[PDB]
Design a protein around this motif. Structure first.
Motif, short mmCIF file in Angstrom:
data_model
loop_
_atom_site.label_atom_id
_atom_site.label_comp_id
_atom_site.label_asym_id
_atom_site.label_seq_id
_atom_site.Cartn_x
_atom_site.Cartn_y
_atom_site.Cartn_z
N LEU A 21 -24.85 -48.93 38.06
CA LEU A 21 -24.57 -48.73 36.63
C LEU A 21 -23.07 -48.81 36.35
O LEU A 21 -22.63 -49.49 35.41
CB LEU A 21 -25.13 -47.37 36.17
CG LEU A 21 -24.90 -46.95 34.72
CD1 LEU A 21 -25.48 -48.03 33.80
CD2 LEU A 21 -25.56 -45.60 34.44
N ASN A 22 -22.28 -48.13 37.18
CA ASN A 22 -20.81 -48.16 37.03
C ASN A 22 -20.22 -49.54 37.30
O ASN A 22 -19.29 -49.96 36.57
CB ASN A 22 -20.13 -47.05 37.85
CG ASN A 22 -20.25 -45.66 37.20
OD1 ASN A 22 -20.55 -45.56 36.02
ND2 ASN A 22 -20.00 -44.58 37.99
N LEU A 23 -20.75 -50.26 38.29
CA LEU A 23 -20.31 -51.64 38.52
C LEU A 23 -20.64 -52.54 37.32
O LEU A 23 -19.82 -53.39 36.95
CB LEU A 23 -20.94 -52.22 39.80
CG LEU A 23 -20.54 -51.56 41.15
CD1 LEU A 23 -21.31 -52.12 42.33
CD2 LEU A 23 -19.04 -51.64 41.37
N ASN A 24 -21.81 -52.35 36.72
CA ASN A 24 -22.17 -53.13 35.52
C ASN A 24 -21.27 -52.82 34.29
O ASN A 24 -20.93 -53.71 33.48
CB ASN A 24 -23.64 -52.92 35.16
CG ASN A 24 -24.20 -54.05 34.29
OD1 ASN A 24 -23.82 -55.21 34.45
ND2 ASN A 24 -25.15 -53.73 33.47
N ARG A 25 -20.90 -51.56 34.16
CA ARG A 25 -19.90 -51.15 33.15
C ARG A 25 -18.56 -51.83 33.38
O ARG A 25 -17.96 -52.32 32.42
CB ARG A 25 -19.72 -49.63 33.14
CG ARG A 25 -20.91 -48.91 32.54
CD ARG A 25 -20.91 -47.44 32.91
NE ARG A 25 -21.88 -46.65 32.15
CZ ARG A 25 -22.16 -45.37 32.38
NH1 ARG A 25 -21.57 -44.71 33.38
NH2 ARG A 25 -23.03 -44.72 31.61
N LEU A 26 -18.12 -51.90 34.64
CA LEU A 26 -16.89 -52.64 34.98
C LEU A 26 -17.01 -54.12 34.61
O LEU A 26 -16.07 -54.71 34.06
CB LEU A 26 -16.51 -52.49 36.46
CG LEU A 26 -16.16 -51.09 36.99
CD1 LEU A 26 -15.67 -51.21 38.42
CD2 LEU A 26 -15.13 -50.39 36.11
N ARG A 27 -18.16 -54.71 34.92
CA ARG A 27 -18.39 -56.11 34.59
C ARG A 27 -18.33 -56.34 33.09
O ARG A 27 -17.70 -57.29 32.61
CB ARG A 27 -19.76 -56.59 35.09
CG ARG A 27 -20.04 -58.05 34.71
CD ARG A 27 -21.28 -58.57 35.39
NE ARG A 27 -22.52 -57.94 34.92
CZ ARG A 27 -23.50 -58.55 34.24
NH1 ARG A 27 -23.39 -59.81 33.85
NH2 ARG A 27 -24.60 -57.87 33.90
N1 LIG Z 1 -17.89 -44.60 33.02
C1 LIG Z 1 -17.52 -45.30 34.16
N2 LIG Z 1 -17.57 -46.64 34.10
C2 LIG Z 1 -17.22 -47.26 35.23
C3 LIG Z 1 -16.83 -46.59 36.36
CL1 LIG Z 1 -16.40 -47.50 37.74
C4 LIG Z 1 -16.79 -45.21 36.31
N3 LIG Z 1 -16.37 -44.47 37.43
C5 LIG Z 1 -16.25 -43.07 37.50
C6 LIG Z 1 -15.58 -42.36 36.51
C7 LIG Z 1 -15.46 -40.99 36.58
C8 LIG Z 1 -16.00 -40.29 37.64
C9 LIG Z 1 -16.67 -41.01 38.61
C10 LIG Z 1 -16.80 -42.38 38.55
N4 LIG Z 1 -17.15 -44.55 35.20
#
Ligand SMILES: Nc1ncc(Cl)c(Nc2ccccc2)n1
Length: 130
Positions: A21-27
């Motif tokens: 999910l976080n990788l997709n947000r980065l993308r």
């Molecule tokens: N919202 C969001 N979007 C992308 C990433 Cl990579 C990310 N990482 C992250 C931020 C705070 C704490 C732990 C992980 N968070």
């Protein structure tokens, strides 16, 4: 939440899907993307490591000492870009949006990208229509 895994370690249930999910947000925000994939004059920004993790074709390209430094990769111009877009979304989400109207393009694209679990899955859905 978490649980005691088969190896007696603490295992976090949502960790793998949260990373994805976080990788997709980065993308989506174009953060640390390191390659553009060009399909039928459409451009798709992505992370090489995610591509390699999901696709035999991308694995081969990015482990090649020569090709691993390319920041632009062209695919076969007969590849359907919607087919590609669906598979790229799948890579970053685990969700495969198969429809009657796209399944053949998705299957052809998955075969080209060497995504064998997706290919098998398209086979079963096609075979059930018959
Ligand atoms: N919202 C969001 N979007 C992308 C990433 Cl990579 C990310 N990482 C992250 C931020 C705070 C704490 C732990 C992980 N968070």
């Amino acid at each position: 939440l978490y649980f005691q895994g088969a190896d007696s370690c603490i295992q976090f249930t949502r960790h793998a899907s949260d990373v994805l999910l976080n990788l997709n947000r980065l993308r989506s925000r174009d953060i640390l993307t390191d390659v553009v994939i060009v399909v039928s004059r459409e451009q798709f920004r992505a992370h090489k490591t995610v591509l390699m993790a999901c696709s035999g074709l991308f694995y081969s390209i990015f482990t090649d000492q020569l090709k691993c430094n390319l920041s632009v990769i062209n695919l076969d111009p007969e590849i359907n870009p919607e087919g590609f877009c669906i598979l790229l979304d799948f890579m970053y989400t685990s969700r495969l949006n198969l429809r009657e109207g796209n399944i053949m393009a998705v299957m052809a694209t998955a075969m080209y990208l060497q995504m064998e679990h997706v290919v098998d899955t398209c086979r079963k859905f096609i075979k059930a229509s018959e």
